[PDB]
Amino acid sequence: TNLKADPEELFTKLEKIGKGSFGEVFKGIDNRTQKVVAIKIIDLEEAEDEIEDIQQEITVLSQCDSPYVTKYYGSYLKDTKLWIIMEYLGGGSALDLLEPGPLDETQIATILREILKGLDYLHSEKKIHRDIKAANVLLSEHGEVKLADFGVATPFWMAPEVIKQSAYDSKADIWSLGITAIELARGEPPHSELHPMKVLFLIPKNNPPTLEGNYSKPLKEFVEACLNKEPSFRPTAKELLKHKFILRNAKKTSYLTELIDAHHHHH
C-alpha cells in the first residue's frame, strides 16, 4: 500500500455504490485518467481485529491477472483510513440484476459460464474464491462478468465440509456455484427464509438442495452435479464448462447488456 501519495488528490470520491466488507464503497474518478474506479474506504481505527483479513484479500487480488477477476489498482493510507482502489463495473452485481424479474436460461447459462471461467483461472492458480454468490459476481457496462469479494481464508452458500470445518479445497467453490445457480434461477438460495443458525445445521444434516420449478432438465442436472455432498463427486470447473446446460444455452456476454438495460429502466 502507498503511504506517501494522498488518495484524496489522486481520486475524486463520488456516490456510495455498495456496502462492502469492512467499509463503504464509492464510485470514484481517477483524476489522472478520468476513468471511473470503485473505492473502498476502511477506517483502521474502527476495524482493527480484521486488518489481517483485509491484507490477505489485497494480496490475493494483487496476484490475480484474469479478465474474469475484478482488477485491483492499489491501496493508500491516509490518516486512519485505508483506500482500496478497484476496477469499476457499471452493470452492477448479478444479484442486483435479478430485481426486475426472472432470468431466462440463456442469461443463467451465460453468467454461470463466465463464473466458471473465473473459477477455472483461480483453481489453476491454486486459489479458492470462498464466497461465490450472486452478490459477488459483477458485470461491466458491456456485459463482461467478473468475480469480486473473495471470502476470508452468512451460511447459505457454504459447502457442508466448510461448515463442518473439514479440510476443504476448490470443490467448495463448486458447491457454492451450485447454490448460485439456484439463486440465479429462483432469486434466492435454498433456506433463504430460515434463521442462519438453523441453516448452519441443515446444510450438513440434509440431503443437498435441488432446483425446484419448471426449469430445463440440463439446468437441474447442472445444479445436481455441483451440489453433491461428497466433494470428490463434484465436477471441476473445467469439466462444467463442457456441461450440456452451458453448451446448449450460453451465448455472447454482450447480450447481457439487455439485462443491464432492464435494471436501468426498472429504476
Ligand SMILES: Cc1cccc(-c2ccc(-c3cc4cnc(NCCCN5CCOCC5)nc4n(CCCCN)c3=O)c(Cl)c2)n1
Ligand atoms: C477487504 C477488501 C480487500 C481488498 C479489496 C476489497 C474490495 C472488494 C470489493 C470492491 C468492490 C468493487 C466494485 C466494483 N464495481 C462495483 N460496481 C457496482 C455498481 C452498482 N451500480 C448501482 C447503480 O446502478 C448502476 C450499478 N461495485 C463494487 N463494489 C460494490 C459491490 C460489492 C458487491 N459484493 C465493491 O465492493 C472493492 Cl472497491 C474492494 N476489499
